[PDB]
């Protein structure tokens, strides 16, 4: 309930500085996409900088692929 909502907020508060150091321009979007997955992987990404990089690099490619689809329309 509201406890899991606070858990999801604080996980974003821990992930955002690390992602902002990695990808500062689109840090807010990558944190929002990564926050959708289960919390078990989120706690692992904070302990391993390599696992965080893999999820962030996957998230940046997702936004890049969606921007091309949105540009193909108008």
């Amino acid at each position: 309930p509201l406890g899991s909502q606070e858990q999801k907020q604080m996980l974003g508060e821990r992930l955002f500085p690390l992602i902002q150091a990695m990808h500062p321009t689109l840090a807010g979007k990558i944190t929002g996409m990564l926050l959708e997955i289960d919390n078990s992987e989120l706690l692992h990404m904070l302990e391993s900088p390599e696992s965080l990089r893999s999820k962030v690099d996957e998230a940046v490619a997702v936004l890049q692929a969606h921007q091309a689809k949105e540009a193909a329309q108008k």
């Binding site: 955002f16 807010g28 979007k29 944190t31 929002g32 996409m33 959708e36 997955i37 996957e58 997702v62």
Partner: peptide, 20 residues
């Protein structure tokens, strides 16, 4: 493995949208 590009943006200090 599925990531949503339309996921709500996370801004520190304000409650995240799509919060269930």
């Amino acid at each position: 493995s599925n990531l949503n590009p339309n996921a709500p943006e996370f801004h520190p200090g304000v409650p995240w949208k799509g919060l269930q």
